[PDB]
Design a protein around this ligand. Structure first.
Ligand SMILES: N=C(N)NCCCC(=O)C(=O)O
Ligand SMILES: [Fe+2]
Length: 332
């Protein structure tokens, strides 16, 4: 498989769950400043075999994601899937949110955005009635097209963590790497040049938050400066693209041809990852784009529901976008 996979033994999974419950018992909230600081140290008490996997798998050159299977989730204890992300911090989902943050802490520094789900660090992915054909993760009937998370921003995550609270009908997350086996060197050269526009996605709009950082989003949408799609090593490039929000620099037809080719090659090599209940994936946001297949929402209380978190290897890389001393990014 193009991702690195780990399956917890029932004993390891039980121990991890017990640790997260202990944290849920001792701290007021996952996003509080206290638990943000402690989680990386508390995570040192997770099962050793898991810590070894996370430390090694992160350093391998190839995987598109790190996938951990086998966290128990009791649907009766969990309760119904929320109708909106606003009311999605239910008691039943609370221990699993702490669990996600513990796992996340093994990989880097977690953060949120001031313009996304009210600045929450642990966010929710679930279908929202009336929003089936939007370009955000609360869509359903319309496929969520492939993208680098927060492609518009230089402070975008290195890893995106997704923990499946439930997914009864096996709806697939989509993934693709750099199509290096098919890109010719001329097209590759052009993708490495600063000749592309990448605007902020709809999740950063005021309409997708509850009733100053929105100024910076407006500027990124109105006046995007040319950037490259590929960076770093030519034999293993890092990727920055959004299928629905990328464009060539104005009038640049060679850049346009390279992006058109890239779209075609990514469409053709897109593959599926089904996060069953209890599965956690940490997607390498520099090696891979991701999305989610179209699905018919239920709206009966058992819709697919994920908890999500953004992770950077270095929080100081984004200090320009710090609001205060919080873990919430944004600019004017
Ligand atoms: N091709 C796209 N739709 N890109 C934007 C994806 C939005 C997203 O991941 C979120 O809702 O947080
Ligand atoms: Fe995403």
């Amino acid at each position: 498989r193009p991702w690195s996979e780990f399956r917890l033994t029932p004993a390891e999974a039980a121990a991890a769950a017990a640790l997260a419950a202990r944290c849920a018992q001792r701290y007021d909230e996952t996003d509080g400043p206290e638990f943000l600081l402690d989680a990386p140290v508390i995570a040192h008490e997770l099962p050793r075999r898991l810590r070894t996997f996370m430390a090694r798998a992160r350093l391998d050159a190839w995987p598109h994601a790190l996938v951990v299977r086998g966290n128990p989730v009791d649907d009766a204890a969990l309760g119904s899937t929320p109708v909106h992300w606003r009311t999605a911090r239910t008691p039943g989902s609370r221990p699993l949110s702490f669990l996600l943050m513990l796992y996340a802490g093994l990989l880097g520094d977690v953060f949120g955005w001031a313009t996304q789900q009210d600045g929450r660090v642990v966010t929710d992915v679930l279908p929202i009635k009336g929003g089936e054909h939007t370009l955000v993760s609360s869509s359903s009937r319309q496929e969520l097209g492939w993208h680098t998370e927060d492609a518009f921003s230089p402070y975008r995550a290195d890893y995106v963590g997704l923990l499946s609270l439930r997914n009864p009908d096996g709806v697939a997350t989509t993934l693709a790497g750099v199509p290096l086996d098919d890109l010719d060197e001329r097209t590759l050269d052009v993708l490495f040049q600063e000749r592309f526009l990448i605007r902020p996605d709809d999740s950063h709009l005021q309409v997708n938050n509850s009733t100053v950082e929105f100024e910076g989003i407006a500027q990124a949408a109105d006046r995007p400066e040319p950037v490259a799609i590929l960076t770093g090593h030519r034999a293993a490039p890092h990727l920055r693209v959004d299928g629905d929000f990328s464009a060539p620099a104005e009038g640049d037809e060679e850049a346009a041809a390279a992006l058109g080719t890239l779209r075609k090659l990514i469409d053709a090599s897109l593959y599926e990852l089904v996060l069953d209940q209890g599965d956690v994936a940490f997607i390498d946001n520099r090696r891979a784009v991701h999305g989610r297949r179209a699905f018919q929402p239920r709206y009966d209380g058992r819709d697919r529901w994920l908890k999500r978190i953004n992770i950077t290897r270095d929080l100081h890389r984004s200090r320009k976008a710090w609001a205060g001393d919080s873990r919430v990014l944004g600019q004017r």
